[PDB]
Amino acid sequence: YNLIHLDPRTREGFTLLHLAVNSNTPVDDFHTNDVCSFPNALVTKLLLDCGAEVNAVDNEGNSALHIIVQYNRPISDFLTLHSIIISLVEAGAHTDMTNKQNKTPLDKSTTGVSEILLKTQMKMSLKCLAARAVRANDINYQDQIPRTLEEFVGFH
Amino acid sequence: QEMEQTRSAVDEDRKMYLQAAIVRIMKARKVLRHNALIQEVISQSRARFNPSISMIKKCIEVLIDKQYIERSQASADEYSYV
Amino acid sequence: TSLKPRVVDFDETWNKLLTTIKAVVMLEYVERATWNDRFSDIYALCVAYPEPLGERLYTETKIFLENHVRHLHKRVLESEEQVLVMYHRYWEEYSKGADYMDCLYRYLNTQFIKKPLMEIGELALDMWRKLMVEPLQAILIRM
Amino acid sequence: DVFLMIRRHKTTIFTDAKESSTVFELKRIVEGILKRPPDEQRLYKDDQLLDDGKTLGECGFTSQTARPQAPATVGLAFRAFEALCIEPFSSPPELP
Amino acid sequence: MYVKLISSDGHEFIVKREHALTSGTIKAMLSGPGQFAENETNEVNFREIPSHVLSKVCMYFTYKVRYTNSSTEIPEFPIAPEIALELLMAANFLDC
Amino acid sequence: FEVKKWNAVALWAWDIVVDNCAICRNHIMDLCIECQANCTVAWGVCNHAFHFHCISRWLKTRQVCPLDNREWEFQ
Amino acid sequence: NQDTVIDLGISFQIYVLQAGAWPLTQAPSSTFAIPQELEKSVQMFELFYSQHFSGRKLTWLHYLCTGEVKMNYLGKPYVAMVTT
Numbered sequence: 001y002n003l004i005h006l007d008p009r010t011r012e013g014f015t016l017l018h019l020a021v022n023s024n025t026p027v028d029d030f031h032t033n034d035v036c037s038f039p040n041a042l043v044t045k046l047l048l049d050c051g052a053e054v055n056a057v058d059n060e061g062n063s064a065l066h067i068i069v070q071y072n073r074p075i076s077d078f079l080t081l082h083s084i085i086i087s088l089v090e091a092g093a094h095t096d097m098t099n100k101q102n103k104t105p106l107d108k109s110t111t112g113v114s115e116i117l118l119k120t121q122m123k124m125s126l127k128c129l130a131a132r133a134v135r136a137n138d139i140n141y142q143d144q145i146p147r148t149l150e151e152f153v154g155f156h
Numbered sequence: 157q158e159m160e161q162t163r164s165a166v167d168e169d170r171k172m173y174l175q176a177a178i179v180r181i182m183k184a185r186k187v188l189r190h191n192a193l194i195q196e197v198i199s200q201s202r203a204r205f206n207p208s209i210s211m212i213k214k215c216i217e218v219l220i221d222k223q224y225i226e227r228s229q230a231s232a233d234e235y236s237y238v
Numbered sequence: 239t240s241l242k243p244r245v246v247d248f249d250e251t252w253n254k255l256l257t258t259i260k261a262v263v264m265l266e267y268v269e270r271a272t273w274n275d276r277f278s279d280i281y282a283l284c285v286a287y288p289e290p291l292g293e294r295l296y297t298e299t300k301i302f303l304e305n306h307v308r309h310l311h312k313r314v315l316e317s318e319e320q321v322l323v324m325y326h327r328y329w330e331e332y333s334k335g336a337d338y339m340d341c342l343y344r345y346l347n348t349q350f351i352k353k354p355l356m357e358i359g360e361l362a363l364d365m366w367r368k369l370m371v372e373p374l375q376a377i378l379i380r381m
Numbered sequence: 382d383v384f385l386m387i388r389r390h391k392t393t394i395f396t397d398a399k400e401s402s403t404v405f406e407l408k409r410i411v412e413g414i415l416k417r418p419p420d421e422q423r424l425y426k427d428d429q430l431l432d433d434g435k436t437l438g439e440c441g442f443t444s445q446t447a448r449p450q451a452p453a454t455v456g457l458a459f460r461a462f463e464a465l466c467i468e469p470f471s472s473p474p475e476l477p
Numbered sequence: 478m479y480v481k482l483i484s485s486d487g488h489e490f491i492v493k494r495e496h497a498l499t500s501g502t503i504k505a506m507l508s509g510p511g512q513f514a515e516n517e518t519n520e521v522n523f524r525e526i527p528s529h530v531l532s533k534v535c536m537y538f539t540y541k542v543r544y545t546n547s548s549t550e551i552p553e554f555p556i557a558p559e560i561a562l563e564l565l566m567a568a569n570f571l572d573c
Numbered sequence: 574f575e576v577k578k579w580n581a582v583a584l585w586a587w588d589i590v591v592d593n594c595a596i597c598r599n600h601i602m603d604l605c606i607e608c609q610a611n612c613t614v615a616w617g618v619c620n621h622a623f624h625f626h627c628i629s630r631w632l633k634t635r636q637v638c639p640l641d642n643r644e645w646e647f648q
Numbered sequence: 649n650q651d652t653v654i655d656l657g658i659s660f661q662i663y664v665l666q667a668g669a670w671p672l673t674q675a676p677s678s679t680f681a682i683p684q685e686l687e688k689s690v691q692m693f694e695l696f697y698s699q700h701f702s703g704r705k706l707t708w709l710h711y712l713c714t715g716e717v718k719m720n721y722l723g724k725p726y727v728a729m730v731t732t
């Protein structure tokens with residue numbers, strides 16, 4: 001908790017939970033290559049219930065969910081892929097965020113299984129659909145919406 | 157009938173485990189003779205079934221068709237992979 | 239009007255809200271139209287330009303709750319013979335009032351408090367704990 | 382299932398119904414939720430009346446047409462029948 | 478079992494109580510002195526949102542109640558370009 | 574007719590459309606027979622998902638799907 | 649805990665079993681239809697399993713599940729129970 005409340009970001013913007021759900025996380029070639037495997041379903045849950053910001057944003061724009069749904073070993077590593085997506089979504093992840101390329105986690109899902117799991121866990125809301133329609137239609141929302149909702153349209 | 161079905165399912169799982177054991181041993185050795193490979197396969201599978209030599213030789217013959225293990229050009233006794 | 243962020247006068251809207259939340263936390267009668275109107279009042283206070291009057295609304299609600307609990311405490315101390323019955327009656331009233339206040343202040347709890355602070359239901363229960371039962375703890379325990 | 386937006390001037394009603402059902406059930410639903418006798422409800426779907434016993438699937442709207450997203454409008458009237466004066470919705474503010 | 482949702486422009490949208498409890502603000506409006514209206518109607522007075530956006534959120538209540546399991550696929554919800562940014566504030570207020 | 578009280582049994586499984594790698598007859602969660610002692614999964618256009626090592630060896634043998642007579646294509 | 653009051657009309661007890669662990673299978677090609685009086689229960693449990701234990705599919709075994717029956721025509725002589 002003490003570390004995760006310092007907001008530790010790497011040079012690419014990965015918070016301490018982006019790395020825990022990332023396949024491309026450097027594990028040392030020495031004896032840590034065996035025990036320490038990333039993405040980890042237990043490290044992600046430990047960070048989540050130790051107070052990690054699940055809606056943290058990479059410098060590229062990807063959230064913590066845009067990275068796990070890009071995992072390239074879905075069927076081989078279903079138990080890790082399933083339990084992480086379960087943990088993030090019920091830990092507060094917003095399964096509609098758009099990165100700086102304006103892509104939802106379903107759009108940034110290079111896997112059918114990740115799409116199926118996310119769509120199973122995707123809870124629909126009219127705020128999300130209305131924000132998607134506002135962003136997609138290029139409606140000028142500045143100074144016409146609540147300030148707290150300006151961010152909400154911002155990550156859609 | 158269900159007893160016979162179970163006693164045939166154990167034979168199918170026995171064949172699959174024998175093939176897996178042959179492939180694992182031939183990837184841990186990369187070359188072995190028939191007389192040594194049969195004994196190694198028998199010794200590896202003892203906590204499970206005791207395998208009849210006909211079953212091991214049938215599995216090692218059908219793995220040739222799948223190219224997991226191949227006979228060396230020197231003699232059919234020698235074995236290799238491809 | 240509509241849900242566009244307005245520039246609301248905090249004094250008049252907060253006075254109307256004070257009337258309705260006093261009549262709510264005292265379990266008096268408020269018109270259903272008035273209650274649904276003060277949801278709009280809460281929304282307008284938590285959204286208005288140029289500065290969102292969310293923290294001011296939270297502070298004013300906390301001050302009103304403190305004053306109300308202090309008034310209840312003083313009346314209960316005045317009724318020394320039936321301190322116990324008065325505490326029960328005013329606790330039932332204040333519990334239902336805190337529940338209805340957490341209902342009415344749902345926008346603060348969901349958009350400002352949770353995004354630190356404590357929700358209005360939790361705030362009301364905490365004010366009751368720190369201003370109604372903890373001061374006259376000894377009298378209640380002994381009786 | 383078929384979802385309907387039964388309109389009567391200002392009073393708009395959102396009702397779920399089954400394709401294998403009659404407009405008898407629709408009239409009973411609207412009189413139960415409108416507190417009216419179950420005979421003055423005269424539907425005016427696209428300005429043409431429909432029989433009181435025929436199924437609403439055959440009335441012109443199917444399950445693939447009156448989806449939940451855009452329910453089919455069913456105008457309504459009551460005996461004093463009254464003229465169809467279905468008020469339109471509020472005008473949206475110009476363009477995005 | 479049938480709540481009424483009066484809009485700012487007079488329109489009264491009647492939708493099921495189970496349908497209109499998917500929004501947090503209506504659930505809070507019907508929890509408290511707002512429940513003391515009775516008359517089986519349990520009306521709520523939305524003095525803010527116009528008629529078209531209230532109709533769209535009622536259609537969304539129906540759409541979410543229908544497609545909540547998502548067994549195979551949920552079809553797209555047709556937000557009009559003009560109704561967005563006015564349904565966004567409405568869906569924020571209602572916490573849909 | 575009606576049932577007053579009921580008792581049922583259900584066999585839950587993962588929602589993946591593919592169940593087993595029909596080369597080594599192994600489940601896809603664990604590793605292939607070549608790969609058990611020392612893996613990714615290769616899909617196909619015909620909804621045929623098998624082990625990467627098994628698919629590589631099979632295509633090294635022939636360009637035919639193990640179940641039907643179709644040309645193997647990657648994803 | 650659901651919004652509407654759910655009238656199952658049943659005391660639903662189920663054994664949710666791993667597919668690979670148990671030696672059971674849907675070997676028969678029977679297309680047995682779920683009875684309508686408990687189809688509500690099976691649909692409610694499908695919804696519950698999708699809600700909580702998501703990502704899993706249920707293959708119901710209709711030839712290992714038993715339940716009591718109501719005899720409204722045979723003469724109501726107490727009760728009896730058989731398999732589905």
Ligand SMILES: [Zn+2]
Pocket residue numbers: 604605607608609612613624625626
């Ligand atoms: Zn492998």
Ligand SMILES: [Zn+2]
Pocket residue numbers: 594595596597598599605606623624627
């Ligand atoms: Zn394989």
Ligand SMILES: [Zn+2]
Pocket residue numbers: 617619621638639640641643
């Ligand atoms: Zn194929």
